[model samples]
Target chain A: WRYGGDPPWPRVSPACAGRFQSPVDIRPQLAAFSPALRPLELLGFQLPPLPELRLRNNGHSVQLTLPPGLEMALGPGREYRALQLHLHWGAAGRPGSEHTVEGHRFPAEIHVVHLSTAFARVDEALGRPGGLAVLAAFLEEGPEENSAYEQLLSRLEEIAEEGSETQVPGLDISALLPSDFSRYFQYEGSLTTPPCAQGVIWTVFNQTVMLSAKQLHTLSDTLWGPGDSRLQLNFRATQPLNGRVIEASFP
Target chain B: WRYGGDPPWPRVSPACAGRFQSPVDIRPQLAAFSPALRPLELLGFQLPPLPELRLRNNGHSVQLTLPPGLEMALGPGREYRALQLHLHWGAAGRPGSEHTVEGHRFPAEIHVVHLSTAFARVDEALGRPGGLAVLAAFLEEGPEENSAYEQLLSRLEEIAEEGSETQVPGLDISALLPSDFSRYFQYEGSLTTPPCAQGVIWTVFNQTVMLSAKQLHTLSDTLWGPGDSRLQLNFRATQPLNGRVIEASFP
Candidate 1:
């Protein structure tokens, strides 16, 4: 009944056996330098507080859907519009992040999904090469509460159960990301969940966002399943590198 | 300027640093049986003789472009249109496959990329959860040359250099795939190359296609790089299966 297994549950396909899989062990020792790797260029991320933002508990994780206007341009003439953002976490004190750094684990992770402007719809870009872009930031446990996450966490009680959703106004998408974008890792990988497509251009920042234990509890302890139990360990396990290269933006 | 490194080069992001990656070691001990794993349902794959098929040396690999009228529907009503197919091989006896069965590597691998029909365009589906599907098949050394591969290998001399492309007509798309798709491994993973997006629904066939040593030599021995040296070791290394479950279509 688990992932990558036999019937009744979604199993892994021969394509999953591909060479360029995601959630790789990014050891500092294995990374190389490339001059072509450019800095992360984001546009329209600074939202002007228009309508409401949708927050939903999609069984697996809590997702915040974005309205039009936010986009990230990775380089000259290349841009991807923001679609939605979600979170992945583990049980209390356990690392739930899909990715690991030199075997180090984080308390949580955030993925900002985007669709290329070249495509008319997000669905159009799913399978093409370089059709999607995901900007990921790791969440480490800290003593201080992260105010940036407060906008979403404040309404966590409303969407406490699976298939639940709510609307909120006046959220700053920029607050969820780290200020510095010069240092990060870039690679070609797929979604971590089912129907794992390999069209995403992943940009994981070297810098991490800090959240307090209370915020972490709100994420890990909150009930998002059909049952009363909380949704913990929602992240997928790390995959093999095969031989795909992982690029870096900074020294 | 290799993958997974420091400044001047794009490095592996912390997101890529996650645990759930693809192309894992499919050990017999690790595979579990689930009744939900359904058989692969491919639609419109048996293509009639096409007018012209484009074969290009894309610097990374030799790819065959597919036209309209070919599509693959995984299950239920889910359908993904075929985009292109490519091959990954290594030098003779080098075992260039990305996914290994209990650490055993194959001589070569093939990837059939597809875009979800839910989107109007393939580019719209990239990075979205479950927006793409890839069918992969392994190739091992055999006694005789594979006639299916002959169509591709015969013209290897023309497009030996990187970026060179040629169009050939009257090729059967079905010849590229294995006879059986009943037994396979299905899981969530990403593309095997750069812009390694994690949006692929991988369906790796249990049955491997066979190729003669000479045919394999023609593929491995062919030149697709700018340098005079042969393009060898094109496959990525095997990735780790942090916690992903490998599901089998059959028990």
Candidate 2:
């Protein structure tokens, strides 16, 4: 039922457009958990030593310009292009989750959207069929000490405004990669956000990143407005796999 | 540790070859009890309905010439060609297995090796790099009253010997695919047999196909030569993921 016709969202009344969707928040969408336990491996693209990645803070949002050569296997058709990176957090009182696991929503999620490169530029890719692929990472409460994430959290004060941009000095993007890159689940689904494009390939890692409560609170308060108007939840309920086979290394 | 550089293998001297070789006839290499519960969508190819491929005997290892127009998603340097399907069974007595599960061996395993177009033909593809992409299916033992695998078992009588070729009429090959095609774990590994060339993109399904004891016994008896040579066990130990990530999907 999930695949035979158009997605259910388009059928919803216009009023639902602005409604905070299920699976509130995007951070938890990154490395959502599943009941299935399968071991995996990684082969390509080595992570360079942690380097300072310049981060720009816009008052309403933040941007981190990706360095060249950071890419993913597009499979047969070059349908998607890697675009900007962004984070979603919990509201002042609640967390924003972009991913849900078997109906259980998480606290935060990060989406790395890649519009199709087939077009001359990133904006143009969004208009074509099968034009985008997004890499999502989920975050949850974990160990108290996270050395890798400390650098980014330290800069929260400078880019606290809604659309502010700040150059993140001395940050290694590679450090964001999950410990285990193998054993992932891939599917052709719509983007969890607006202009939800169908046929986009979603490659979600099966591992969750540990974020201390203090760090998560900092990100949520900075990214989402601190007051009651804070948009805490950002996750979407899981779409049905519709008889789709989830392939893995071990059976 | 399983993740260590070189594992212990019997008789094979690593000091000279300097390569790790897995032990043959050991059941400890089977993957744990995870089973493929659904079918996967074939991304680019249109598969035929489930084929009732009947078997005809010609003597020697039974041959199931795959239907034409069988397209598979080959790696960057590979192409789709003909398929070479073979069966693995346990010993004449008890405890037969080809692939191990959670250090436990199963009764049998079937590997339908498809030679990539990069190789001249199926024969050459068998022992070359990126030459073959095998789709492995596991067969487990069950009650004789169950009729799930009756169709595939009935034909074994005709080609139970080595080199036996069975021509099935009006059979469809597409039905054998798992419905959930997108959720898969992919890795770069080598063949489980001789001429183990690396660089193969292994895409193993997380599902299992049902085969009654009769079917399992039929394959085991047919694959091993005449006389008391039990054919029930033919699986090899689970090889190392070698720090590779298992990419899977279910969307």
Candidate 3:
């Protein structure tokens, strides 16, 4: 069943065909200033005495599940709980990010999915407008491997097979995020994958997180998918803007 | 940023950390034969002439937006509506499928994502257990280019970059599917991507859809992602089975 093929299913969803799809290319030139966009406030992101964290090879990408207690306020009085996060990358040297800037590809991309706290469950929040929030960060290659990614990369061999998982203690989740959060592009869009549900509030940080080439290689070389094929490029192509407005917290 | 990293986020979600992740490798020898697994029934799959189909290069894959009115009943009384469809593939000769059969991999995979009609929208369906059904079909390389993929492929250049889309009219959706639907591997799993929401009922057809080398090349060679990088391998790795039972509709 190739995409755009004939009839068991359509090429896109009604929402995808409609306005406000996600992972749009961020054109700095087109971004508008939004004074309403607030400085992101992360709460419980740095819980001391890290609990045992479960890391798994989800086939799409290796994912680190978030424990409860982590929360973020995108604006005054509106908070979203951290759900889970994942990464997207390409083979060595190729860019595998979902969102790009001015056609510039990063080594990889990271997504942290969240749901509004007003809802008891992530599912309930998904149906309503602004029910979900995603923080997207781009990854670039650096001179040295990031110390933060060392522990996780060291365990890749153990969970190399799909559906495999393991737990590690004392890891800091906030270290993975960029230090600066004041500048980012925000928009209304849908989930990147199937169902491509809309009404998501997307926050893509302008600042990038850096990892050493070797660190990037660890991810690039990791085996995933069927037959333990290397999880080379697990990202969607960017979606169209469709006249949607992209707002920025910083000029 | 990396899984199992230090600081803020936890390693895995309570759902993902628990049992039942998706894209698990299908160990046929370990699969159980369930009489309760009834023959799959597809409904509204053959609709009248589709309106101009919107084909887009979704940074992930080429996806076709579906219209309303398509539905499928996996068994008795449980119906799901076809939302949209997308493709997953590897580079030439490499297997890029999510689910593997006894460690075997085809050249590509196709997923038709659906939502249960009980919910008014897909977002509402995503958070629930067993709220979504994905019909997955493996793609193998064949001797000739599939005509069904021609119309979509011809427009690949138009959407060669990330966030690009085009409309294609008068395409037959059914011709893209495998002729057989009686046999498949069924299991309970989560979405292969982020949020990794659980409760999805996954059905991977035992039969495969064959695409010619040229047709496969069209997909593999087409440029997508940032900077027009080739959209060669856009697939997730296989996940763990975690003691879950895989039931089959046929022996």
Candidate 4:
């Protein structure tokens, strides 16, 4: 049964299925998080200033640096730490979205998963909420003139398909975010992948990055390969809001 | 010269602020639509069994008949009929959403808009997506028992600081989405809102829906007093596939 290069992970526990099965789709029927229960003010801690993290090519996972003095205190909930960032791209013509928007998938995506120091190791954070803060970025196909996305797209032909690897250089994770970070949707959701855990606060941007159609094709066939199970339907459907109120900075 | 209760629509032309501005925040980079170019395909129309559509209480909009079909369309791009739907509340005390996840706004959000029908008048298409579709759903609130979001927590009082008109019945135009759908990210997004707008294609979804905390408060303040804005930011960030072939099914 070991037909693989890299095998898939185990399924998330059934007990945690309901917990992790939630899609962050906030609706009016969901419940709102009460400020009274939030102790940020009680702890006398000021919200950290949004950082301008730069994308540095490390020849492997992109290194994302945090601003000085921006300490992330592990609330009573879980412990998390910033880690390496990587991207998932489809082929030159295909889409590679792990999380689909309105059911339509995109061409590429970037995940900056922050591991929790509390965990014995980063491997443990793979499915636990306290140990992870995954910043997912969507990618689109665009004009060939734009080079920002090329840094990663060009590597496709060189990187073999499914279970393949590539080193993307000269990238910044923060550059992936929308200019004004004020507008976005936030909620407590779960990991869309295996070992889906709950209680993680999901922060999806209202913005997306652009690539090229040619670049898209390279990503799909190369990274995913033919007959790759992982290539198909990797995205989880929208989970229940369970009476949760989704919030944004703007009105 | 104040006209009725409507404040002068503050017009910020490009010359005034170097960009035409309003309560709207647009990210040009995320746009999937090009004025000069047409989309390759309409993602929704390509589905197997064409999605189902039904009218809501408003007689202007329609609700899609399926859930998975929600993935069939993107909102904002191509024209479809607008439909109207209404909210089904449990008791007046336990209304609105409870969980505020990710960075989304609203306790519960309702979308009442129509698709363009070269086939029918936007007015006549009411309550049908082929003609019009209206999506109406409520957010759950409080710690008590209610069929709606009873299992969910009640967190409306925190976000909405000022209460306004409440106890009104029928679809409230005041709660309709603000008209900035144009300057938003348009993709082949799916419908979280009803009639689900599947396969029809989307213009905007991966973006913010604004409603002030005060405005949210007004929603909670009234008997029919304005209930807190059920502005839950219910959306999953984009996905990553490393590039798979993506196509269109729309005109």
Candidate 5:
């Protein structure tokens, strides 16, 4: 509130206020580079074009539901399966990436959520320590078009209102991820939104995915959220690290 | 901000985005303690009753202009003369102290602004490095009344509307500060407000001044600010520390 309106903060669990919360601004230079951490090995991310992919305007964000087909190898006996993916973005005039590099906010961020294979259901992993993983990448502007993202952004209008959803032909969703997977930062943090459960492993890629301006416009201007306001700048404010060490695969 | 409304963060200077910002949450345990930092010495804070202290509702916060008679000695030849003082607070339900302690926000905060004696005018020192100093203290709720605060708070009704001003008899203004001056945290920051000038020397007392619930109510409940709203929760959101080490006078 630039002119003195008290933000109506909702009453939630004490866990929401806990120390390892997510969407922290990653200071790359300060991150300790760890040789022990391996490159993230993902499986089954390239979907066939004929499959039905559900995209929903969840009121908070435009969410794309993922089936159990995709998975990631986190460590020995720590296999994680994909559940859903979503994005955090700003309005046309602003940039709204949840996790910033140093202090620079990207235009948008794509979060691919996964649950530890140890947990059959998301509720089981909701607040459990080390029960979830999120693979994220920043969205930057480029001169050329990113036709891959348009596979999702082009259909946003079909689900423009709250709770509205539609099915789109799935492309190789792997096109969304950065080509270089070895360079990234990792930390233990909670889901950015409430329940704000702590202890999920977070991996943010060093490289960014680019989309043309018109593609960004459709993502930013098409959807209407809960307040009838355009669903934009829907990213949470960055939380403090609170002594947490962010480790990187590359220095 | 808590919801979809993008905080209409005003278009301000690049300085507002600078790394060294003010009103940061001080993690006392993480602060590097130093023996060399001396206790803050003050003079002429006990104004005579005859002098008329100007209290005005500046549509931002209730501001009280202080004459040059009050000053603080930061170090040898670094004399900071008093300029004005104001407060940041919340409404009936929330706590709104500008600076927090380990993420704990007090009910309110009082900031006494000063300009270095070297600067002939405040505008000259507005953005200059180390040209300003601020003495701050937290206002906490206690069982007993803090009559000294009532001297000014009780007069809030007189300046209830924006741009309204009042004249009041001066008392021991120093009573607003904590008794224990030896325990404090020092940091370099910019003004919490616009121009968001950097290079301010900030000292916040570890001890808090106590005020009765009613006295606090008067401070919170009274005064109308900009946008025709009540002047409450006027403090800026805490910014990232960005590697700035907070130094404490006490370990």
Candidate 6:
């Protein structure tokens, strides 16, 4: 896990040091388009802000815990409940998206981890291949401030310390996603963090999300990570695709 | 810090290696009575739960981030704002309190860390001689279950992993404290955790709070820290007093 920097992941998780790793750069030009993949439908994203949302700087990334009753469906039995969402970012000039496009990294990326509500716990879910799903969207800087992201970035100063946390009110969790969910790059991989068991279904949204330059800088520079060091360039290295089929929702 | 484990703290913070360190054992018989000390008053503890409070298993403790506007005061001019609250505990049959009573240990301890809001950041507050205030209360197993404690304990399973978090709604923050706020052992000491920075005015309440046997079991056993290790015996070792004066608000 990047919790202690990127070098010692091998010693931490056997799978992390082995095959079916995560965060591969997508070569959309060579991918198969699976039109059968339905449009992702998210429910329970628009909750009232009274009971504030919990936000934490987990010594790694700023994670917002999603309240229950929030679910995403690819159709019928294909369902996942939102657990938590965390973002990774780069410093001023570095691009930090985990899943790159043609070897180009975006300014940042957000991952929404989901559990197969059927499983009782994460440990059990890990052992069951394809028991988890993660929705990732790349972040790029734009001229206008994105109000949705600002809802979170404005609170960066409050949780600047590693392990520090704060509550944010009136959040629309879905607002953080890209406007278009019609297209995405899909793959089967493991969690970027520890005990990297290979079971996760990843959806890297084809459409990019925008944030103001100030928001990008705040995301990169505000938090402190392990050893009280600045948390920047926090994305993992893109893994080799390993001859696995990378599918796309569109060509 | 108990982040990784209990042994490596001295090497973490220079101040931790030397004087004014915290989690000192208290001997009421050896302490001076300070009737002049006022009853600790906490304002803004009761807030609407619509905007949920952030709860995190911060790789060390279960921290609840208090919302802004909550202020703690020894009386008028001396005021501190609530930043966050976290607990320390031991495994079953193990008394986990950071501070002790003449060699006695409680089941757990809750520390409400306050900031000298006048300062812009915690670093600045740490440097000021008397800038921080922490209100501590001991937890014990009693015959009946405490509803207030249950509000927090029930959510333990939700955030069982280190770096995991969730939003807790409608929390009556003040209910977590013991009823007898007037009786407490007061002293000047350093933080119980890293940096071990001195200047924190400590108030370890005399009356202990109660929880059911079950609630106690969950807090001490549920969480996993740093290396997927069960987080137990998380309290710091009590430090030497170094002839510092300990005061009591009541005889």
What TM-score, computed on C-alpha atoms, does each candidate reach? Answer: 0.52, 0.42, 0.49, 0.37, 0.49, 0.49
Q: Evaluated on chain B only, what is the TM-score of candidate 2?
A: 0.63
Model 6 C-alpha lDDT per residue in residues A92-171, reported as the tens digit of each score:
88888888998899999999999875455677567344468899999999999999889889998999988999999967
- Which residue pairs in candidate 5 have backbone atoms (N, alpha carbon, C) closer than 3 angstroms, thus clashing? none
Best by TM-score: 1
lDDT by residue (tens digit), candidate 4, B83-128? 3322222122333321112322235434444444333343323221
Stronger candidate by TM-score (2 vs 3): 3
Q: How close is candidate 4 to the true structure, as a TM-score?
A: 0.37
Q: Write the per-residue lDDT of candidate 4 for residues A1-251, one digit (tens) a residue.
A: 11123244333254335534434443322323222121110121122334333434222222334332222322222234545555554433455565555456676666655654435465644433334565566777677634554555456555444444533443443555445444344555665554456535565554677656665564444334335343422333456544344543333
What tier of docking accuracy does candidate 1 attain? incorrect
- Tens digit per residue, CA lDDT, model 5, B1-251: 21112344445456677667887999988786654455788899999887788999988788888876888875433468888999999889799899999899999999999987656788766655446899999999999989789899989989898899999897787888999888898877888887678668889999999999998899989888765567888888888776566778876
Q: Interface RMSD for every prediction, one decimal?
A: 17.3, 12.8, 21.5, 22.0, 21.4, 30.6
Better of 1 and 2 by lDDT: 1
Order the candidate numbers by lDDT, best to worst: 6, 5, 3, 1, 2, 4
Evaluated at residue A221, the lDDT of candidate 6 is 84
Where does candidate 2 stray beyond 4 Å? A1-62, A74-82, A115-120, A123-131, A224-228, A240-251, B1-251
Q: Give one digit per residue, the lDDT tens place, for model 3 in B1-251.
A: 11112222224445444356778888887776554455667766664555777888877688988888787877533578888888888876776787889988778888889988657887777755447899999888778778877767778888888888988875556667778777888877887755677668899987888887887777778756644356766665677775566877666
Better of 1 and 6 by DockQ: 1
Candidate lDDT scores, in order, read 0.74, 0.48, 0.75, 0.36, 0.80, 0.81
DockQ for model 4?
A: 0.01
* Candidate number with the higher DockQ (2 or 6): 2
How well does candidate 6 score on lDDT at residue B91? 91
Going through the candidates in order, the fraction of native interface contacts each one reproduces equals 0.00, 0.00, 0.00, 0.00, 0.00, 0.00
**Model 2: how far residue A251 lies from native, Å:** 4.2
Global CA lDDT of candidate 6, please? 0.81
Interface RMSD of 5: 21.4
Q: What is the lDDT of residue A128 in candidate 5?
A: 50
CAPRI class assigned to model 2: incorrect
Q: Of 2 and 3, which scores higher on lDDT?
A: 3
Model 5 CA lDDT for position B186: 83
